[PDB]
Amino acid sequence: MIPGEYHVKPGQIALNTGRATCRVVVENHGDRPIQVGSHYHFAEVNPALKFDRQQAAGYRLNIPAGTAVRFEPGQKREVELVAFAGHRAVFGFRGEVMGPL
């Protein structure tokens, strides 16, 4: 007996199903680490991360909500992106879009 214990049924949850995705190779050219959140507009991340910013337009990291991907200086890796939904309007970040798309 453990007070308030869970009895989670086994299995897995499929995240962000039925949405466009794409893989991109990213490399940190800066001298300081960069960490990106699950819902940040990938195309507007720290300028030191080198990748095809054009392909990442309207995309975010395809990872569980609230988690992140870290890039140490000089680190190169391939990430999977998933397209934004809703109105598909991007406001904020580095202020590059500030509107629909």
Binding site: M1, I2, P3, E5
Partner: protein
């Protein structure tokens, strides 16, 4: 004495621990509040003695064992935190999984 609110608040913790201490002494298996109070008061005295935060983070995991508390209690206490005036001022001691 000019006791500030925080000093008076800690007197409540100290007293709660006296209750637990006497019960542990009778050979009872401590419950949730009794366990938290006993381990917390132990740490506060450790700081008064001049022990380091690092030492207490370790020593605090050896105050009570699973056989001295009620069932489910160890799982109800994933960690214990308490602050006290060390020789170098107030510091926070965090003891992870104090009861095993």
């Amino acid at each position: 004495m000019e006791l500030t609110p925080r000093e008076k608040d800690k007197l409540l913790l100290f007293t709660a621990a006296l209750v637990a201490e006497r019960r542990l002494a009778r050979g009872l298996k401590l419950n949730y509040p009794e366990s938290v109070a006993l381990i917390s008061a132990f740490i506060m005295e450790g700081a008064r003695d001049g022990k380091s935060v690092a030492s207490l983070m370790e020593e605090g995991r050896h105050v009570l064992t699973r056989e001295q508390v009620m069932e489910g209690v160890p799982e109800m206490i994933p960690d214990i935190q308490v602050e006290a005036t060390f020789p170098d001022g107030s510091k926070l001691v965090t003891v992870h999984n104090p009861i095993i």
